[PDB]
Amino acid sequence: QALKKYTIDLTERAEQGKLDPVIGRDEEIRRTIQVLQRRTKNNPVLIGEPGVGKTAIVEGLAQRIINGEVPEGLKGRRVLALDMGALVAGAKYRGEFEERLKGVLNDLAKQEGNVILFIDALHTMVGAGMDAGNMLKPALARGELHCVGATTLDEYRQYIEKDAALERRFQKVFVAEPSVEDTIAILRGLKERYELHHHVQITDPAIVAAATLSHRYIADRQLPDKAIDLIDEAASSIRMQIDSPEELDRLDRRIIQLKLEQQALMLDMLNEELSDKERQYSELEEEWKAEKASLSGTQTIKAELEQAKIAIEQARRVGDLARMSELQYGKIPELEKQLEAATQLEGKTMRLLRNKVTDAEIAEVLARWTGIPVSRMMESEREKLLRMEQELHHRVIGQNEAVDAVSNAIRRSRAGLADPNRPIGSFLFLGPTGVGKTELCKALANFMFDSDEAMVRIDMSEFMEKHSVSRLVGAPPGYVGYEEGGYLTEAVRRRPYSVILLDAVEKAHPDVFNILLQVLDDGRLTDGQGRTVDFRNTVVIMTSNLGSDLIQERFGELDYAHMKELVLGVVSHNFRPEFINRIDEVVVFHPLGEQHIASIAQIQLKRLYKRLEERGYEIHISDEALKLLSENGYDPVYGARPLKRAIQQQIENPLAQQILSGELVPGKVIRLEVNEDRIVAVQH
Amino acid sequence: QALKKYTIDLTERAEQGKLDPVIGRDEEIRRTIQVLQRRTKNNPVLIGEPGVGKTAIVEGLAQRIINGEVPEGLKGRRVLALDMGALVAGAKYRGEFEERLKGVLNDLAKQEGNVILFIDALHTMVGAGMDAGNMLKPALARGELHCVGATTLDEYRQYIEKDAALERRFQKVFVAEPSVEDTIAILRGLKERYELHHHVQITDPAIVAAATLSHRYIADRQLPDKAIDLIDEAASSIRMQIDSPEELDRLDRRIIQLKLEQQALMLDMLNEELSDKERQYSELEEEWKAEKASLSGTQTIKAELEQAKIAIEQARRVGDLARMSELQYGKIPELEKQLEAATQLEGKTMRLLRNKVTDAEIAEVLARWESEREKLLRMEQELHHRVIGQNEAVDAVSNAIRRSRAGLADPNRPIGSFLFLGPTGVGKTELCKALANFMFDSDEAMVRIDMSEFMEKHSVSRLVGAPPGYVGYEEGGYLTEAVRRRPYSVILLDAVEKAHPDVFNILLQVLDDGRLTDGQGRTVDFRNTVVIMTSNLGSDLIQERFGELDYAHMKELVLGVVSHNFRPEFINRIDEVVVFHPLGEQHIASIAQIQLKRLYKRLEERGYEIHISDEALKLLSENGYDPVYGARPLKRAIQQQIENPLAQQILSGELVPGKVIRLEVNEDRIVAVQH
Numbered sequence A: 001q002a003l004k005k006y007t008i009d010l011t012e013r014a015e016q017g018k019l020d021p022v023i024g025r026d027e028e029i030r031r032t033i034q035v036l037q038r039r040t041k042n043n044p045v046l047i048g049e050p051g052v053g054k055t056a057i058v059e060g061l062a063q064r065i066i067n068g069e070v071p072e073g074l075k076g077r078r079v080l081a082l083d084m085g086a087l088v089a090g091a092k093y094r095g096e097f098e099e100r101l102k103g104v105l106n107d108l109a110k111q112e113g114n115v116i117l118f119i120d121a122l123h124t125m126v127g128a129g130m131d132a133g134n135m136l137k138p139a140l141a142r143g144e145l146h147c148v149g150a151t152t153l154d155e156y157r158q159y160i161e162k163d164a165a166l167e168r169r170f171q172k173v174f175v176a177e178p179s180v181e182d183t184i185a186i187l188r189g190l191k192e193r194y195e196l197h198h199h200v201q202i203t204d205p206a207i208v209a210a211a212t213l214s215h216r217y218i219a220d221r222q223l224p225d226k227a228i229d230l231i232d233e234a235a236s237s238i239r240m241q242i243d244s245p246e247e248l249d250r251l252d253r254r255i256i257q258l259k260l261e262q263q264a265l266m267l268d269m270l271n272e273e274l275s276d277k278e279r280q281y282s283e284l285e286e287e288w289k290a291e292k293a294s295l296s297g298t299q300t301i302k303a304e305l306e307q308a309k310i311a312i313e314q315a316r317r318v319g320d321l322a323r324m325s326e327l328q329y330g331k332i333p334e335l336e337k338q339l340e341a342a343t344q345l346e347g348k349t350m351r352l353l354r355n356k357v358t359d360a361e362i363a364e365v366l367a368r369w370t371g372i373p374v375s376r377m378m379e380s381e382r383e384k385l386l387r388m389e390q391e392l393h394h395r396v397i398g399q400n401e402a403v404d405a406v407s408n409a410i411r412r413s414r415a416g417l418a419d420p421n422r423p424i425g426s427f428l429f430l431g432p433t434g435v436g437k438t439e440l441c442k443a444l445a446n447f448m449f450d451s452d453e454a455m456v457r458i459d460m461s462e463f464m465e466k467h468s469v470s471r472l473v474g475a476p477p478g479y480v481g482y483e484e485g486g487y488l489t490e491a492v493r494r495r496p497y498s499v500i501l502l503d504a505v506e507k508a509h510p511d512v513f514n515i516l517l518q519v520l521d522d523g524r525l526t527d528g529q530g531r532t533v534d535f536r537n538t539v540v541i542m543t544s545n546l547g548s549d550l551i552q553e554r555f556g557e558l559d560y561a562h563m564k565e566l567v568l569g570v571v572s573h574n575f576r577p578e579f580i581n582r583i584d585e586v587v588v589f590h591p592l593g594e595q596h597i598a599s600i601a602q603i604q605l606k607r608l609y610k611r612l613e614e615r616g617y618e619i620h621i622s623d624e625a626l627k628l629l630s631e632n633g634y635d636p637v638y639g640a641r642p643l644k645r646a647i648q649q650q651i652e653n654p655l656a657q658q659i660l661s662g663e664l665v666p667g668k669v670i671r672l673e674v675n676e677d678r679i680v681a682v683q684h
Numbered sequence B: 001q002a003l004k005k006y007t008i009d010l011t012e013r014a015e016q017g018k019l020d021p022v023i024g025r026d027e028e029i030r031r032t033i034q035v036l037q038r039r040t041k042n043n044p045v046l047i048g049e050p051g052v053g054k055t056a057i058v059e060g061l062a063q064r065i066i067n068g069e070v071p072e073g074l075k076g077r078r079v080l081a082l083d084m085g086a087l088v089a090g091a092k093y094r095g096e097f098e099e100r101l102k103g104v105l106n107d108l109a110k111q112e113g114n115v116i117l118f119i120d121a122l123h124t125m126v127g128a129g130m131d132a133g134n135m136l137k138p139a140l141a142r143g144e145l146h147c148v149g150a151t152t153l154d155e156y157r158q159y160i161e162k163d164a165a166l167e168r169r170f171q172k173v174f175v176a177e178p179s180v181e182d183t184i185a186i187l188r189g190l191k192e193r194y195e196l197h198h199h200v201q202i203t204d205p206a207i208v209a210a211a212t213l214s215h216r217y218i219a220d221r222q223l224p225d226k227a228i229d230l231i232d233e234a235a236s237s238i239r240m241q242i243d244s245p246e247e248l249d250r251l252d253r254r255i256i257q258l259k260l261e262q263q264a265l266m267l268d269m270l271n272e273e274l275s276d277k278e279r280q281y282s283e284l285e286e287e288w289k290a291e292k293a294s295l296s297g298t299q300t301i302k303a304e305l306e307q308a309k310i311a312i313e314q315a316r317r318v319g320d321l322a323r324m325s326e327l328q329y330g331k332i333p334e335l336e337k338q339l340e341a342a343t344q345l346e347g348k349t350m351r352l353l354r355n356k357v358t359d360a361e362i363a364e365v366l367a368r369w370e371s372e373r374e375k376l377l378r379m380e381q382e383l384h385h386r387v388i389g390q391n392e393a394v395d396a397v398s399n400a401i402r403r404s405r406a407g408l409a410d411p412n413r414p415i416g417s418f419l420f421l422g423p424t425g426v427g428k429t430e431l432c433k434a435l436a437n438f439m440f441d442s443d444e445a446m447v448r449i450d451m452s453e454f455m456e457k458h459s460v461s462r463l464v465g466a467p468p469g470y471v472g473y474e475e476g477g478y479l480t481e482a483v484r485r486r487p488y489s490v491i492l493l494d495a496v497e498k499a500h501p502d503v504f505n506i507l508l509q510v511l512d513d514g515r516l517t518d519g520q521g522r523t524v525d526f527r528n529t530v531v532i533m534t535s536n537l538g539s540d541l542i543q544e545r546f547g548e549l550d551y552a553h554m555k556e557l558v559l560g561v562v563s564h565n566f567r568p569e570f571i572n573r574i575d576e577v578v579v580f581h582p583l584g585e586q587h588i589a590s591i592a593q594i595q596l597k598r599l600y601k602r603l604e605e606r607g608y609e610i611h612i613s614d615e616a617l618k619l620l621s622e623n624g625y626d627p628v629y630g631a632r633p634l635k636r637a638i639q640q641q642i643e644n645p646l647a648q649q650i651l652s653g654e655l656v657p658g659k660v661i662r663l664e665v666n667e668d669r670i671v672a673v674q675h
Ligand SMILES: Nc1ncnc2c1ncn2[C@@H]1O[C@H](COP(=O)(O)OP(=O)(O)OP(O)(O)=S)[C@@H](O)[C@H]1O
Pocket: A020, A021, A022, A023, A024, A025, A049, A050, A051, A052, A053, A054, A055, A056, A151, A152, A186, A190, A224, A225, A228, B040, B164, B168
């Protein structure tokens, strides 16, 4: 024969129950049977992005052939899974490939249409060394084969819409991703399957949270394959933690260590201590065996329940009379209620932990994938949001108003009250140059997701040309950066949960504001390569200096409201009404006071003492030296980077020179005493 | 059956202890035990760079199966290692290979989901002749097979990620290269193995030095394989030096030579000399046999100690009562103390020697294949070797190396920042190449980029990285992209006086943190390099008044001149400003002598012998040296004024070989004569 040599008889497998009873998908099975009951062009192809269960649609079609939900044009049909890889890979020679394939077509035509041929990965058939299309073509035209394809949409439009004859030989059935609730229903059927295998239980809140958080976060793989990945991987982690016991291992190491100690000593007391620890070890071991026996009985009774369900389906196919009522009314409710009695018994007895996969397990598995704070406000990030003013003032002294505004913005977003097409929050930082624009940016990226490195800083001062705009969106096809990628859009597509930091957007060309109009309108910024860039998870922050002299000269005896309205008017003179129209909340910075400069110096002393204690020195400072640093590092035009370069040039250059001179000794208290113009270090 | 015909039971070998004690890798065995117990994707493939013991990760999984340290469902599995190579070519028929593999797969269907299959180099399962992929692509989805793959990343990315009916029956259990201390941990168990085969002793400082030098120097292979091969080859080296001596060879050649002479003379005295040397040879031979007997007894009783350890482990597994305490209290301490007595006895008697493995043996195995002070002294000495002159600059760079390579400076700043001030062509290129030839051990382990061409606005668009679709684009980038090509080198920016303020902004970004991104979004670090610049105005002040002035106030005056020309804060972040003198007579003489050395090497390999006169060297010194260029006019003047009349005369059929070819002078020429 040929058919047993190359194909996989799926109806025999579904008759042996080795498949998945996939719930739903009723319209796609209907449209596949609409195609398969035609006269010519009997060839549906199942098209969708991978993971959506096109193989499962074919297997569910086979299960409906076996049970008999099909019309009277498919009953008794066999479904055979041709393996396109299993015909190419023997052909060394001229015409041994076509030998096999003509053998397959003669045996299927001997069956006389009684065999629905199934071909998975149909885009292997076309380019496989003329080969396989130009023999199947006279059979696919006359309907004497019954091919069912299964392919990704990209391989469809690449390997078939090219070759138009084999395009019209087939027929599309567009398969869409399932919904969230359909994903939940699918996973409920698959829970009822999977708890036979991993010997555990699954609580349906973990199922719905798994589906929702997988749809929220995993943006490469698609439903339901990613949800099944999460559920199965958590089931395997719990199958580990059945036999992971740690306390028995600690007690065994303790008793063998005290055994070696007592055997070396042969005052004693250790016969008594070892007897107590052996008694505790035996009790924990017997409790462990009791838990194992409980889980074994629960698994066996769950397996007998599922075999009873399979047997009552056997009675639904065959048609025994008393067997139906007997199996149902006896076997289903009593086995379910003592399955729940075993469930509450395991809830009583599992001290040595879980057999029920909770949502925290899903959080641990998805955190091992990516690392998001996946779950909700867990009173650690939530109290962080309740002290988000304090959390931002942990690193950024001063500028209370913008801290409050950004805190309110993220408090709106994490509660789900943002308009979910816009990005998380637009910001127009104003005011004096170099106070903590970038420090608030770093602190925001820090206490948003990870750290200061989950950002993209873009100097907008460099973009002053038309081809600069074509750079930062991406060059259109047939041109240059279309080879070598866009600028902004690639930086977003690498870091999808990030912060975009612009720098002096007023120094940019007067048209990049229109790209920002698209950004702050809807957060899709279609690049040069024609694929969308999704800003709905990010935070766009823009910095400027359009009223730095205006704010520094009028901060005295003017409140926050008049300052905001005045700088709104001035920015309206500079910018356009559309651009400031799309902004969520323009904040206004104020100039710095000398106590804030002293606080910046304090934080620099904190980080410098940390670095030099990692180096190995114990250094103290007089506050007079702090006052000299504060007076030598502020100006109305530059701000606190004068303090930074003053700290660098007056500490980091001379004191490290004194260290490298073999002068200073690690461990000594090093008081940074003052000079007339400098700071001297002593060894005391 | 066919399992006996084509598989390798790992569990029987670990059952009889033939395999290796797997050390570490708890996490990867954990991830393997996860992926082995799922319902889908039930086939891991251990993926990493090759030779990191992926086979032994499977073997340690098998050992934990035998020792019961696995979860409950794995308790009772069988690990079988199917060879891709064992199956191939018993076939003249049209697929006898396929028949045998079908018989194996039916046997694994008969074993009913128990046998866990091992295959390494899973790409060979994909293409080897249906051959092994699509005979098993059913069995890799029908639950009758639990294969454990093992391959490199490249074969996974090609031959498995593509094949979409195979792509989701496999997970990437990533196995990384173990660290130095991890490799130490792996070696500390197999040291027990690697003495019982080679009859020697291994010491732990040699092990950590071997791991350190292996990770530092051998870069073809990786850890832990290369450290293990160093240990095993050192064991072979000591096995050779014990089993095979030198003075015995000298004495044997001497006695057979004097035996030849005495047999010839048949005055004598040689009967007496030969008898003395034969007595000495017999004494050394008997001492050598005594040493060999001592080492034989030592290693036999060491193997007895190890078999006592194996026997007390057998008594731990079985549970005999008197055997445990008997084997412990008898067999361990007396055999250990007389093994140490044999060790100190060999320390007394081995003269004719070595039985241990030391770090000197590690150096020997590395050569037949320690950092800061030695590298400091070798750096300074090679500075005095290659580049002539500029000993002040030698000391300046040596001071900067002593300041930066102590580690007590900022690791967020670039290492070497300088300004070469002096006339051109004096050896600035030579100094850069000597820096490169020590610090990265090649002359072109560096980057030379001139800055004199970048006076216009097209400097950041030509040095850093161009906008898309303009002049400086299709070479990549001058400065930034060379570091992406060579992250391990030294950077030069000659003629920085012709710069542009964007370049000064770039260099302040360099001297701040070293990170710098081009116009298309690639973050490039500079801190692992050395950046050097040049100017030629205070150099003209040097050419004016280097004589009768010092070096330090010279440095202060030229730093003031640079402060006139450059920004003070721009040159403030520079580590050290150096001064280059005009080399005048003796260094010109030396570099001309170097050019004469390479000329003499080529003319000696022709077969001549040429001696220069010092007067002709003075003519070359006066004709080639100039105050504006240095010595590249001296190079072409050497080329012309020597080689062209010389090659004129040699091809004249004139200068006979084998004579002193004296470079005398004419009134204006440099002529060679024959006498
Ligand atoms: N409705 C469903 N009910 C139950 N399981 C499903 C359902 N749809 C998909 N699955 C499961 O999803 C997994 C694979 O889904 P598929 O859609 O078959 O992925 P796929 O068909 O292999 O797609 P590609 O392109 O071949 S990767 C199997 O474990 C199926 O059981």
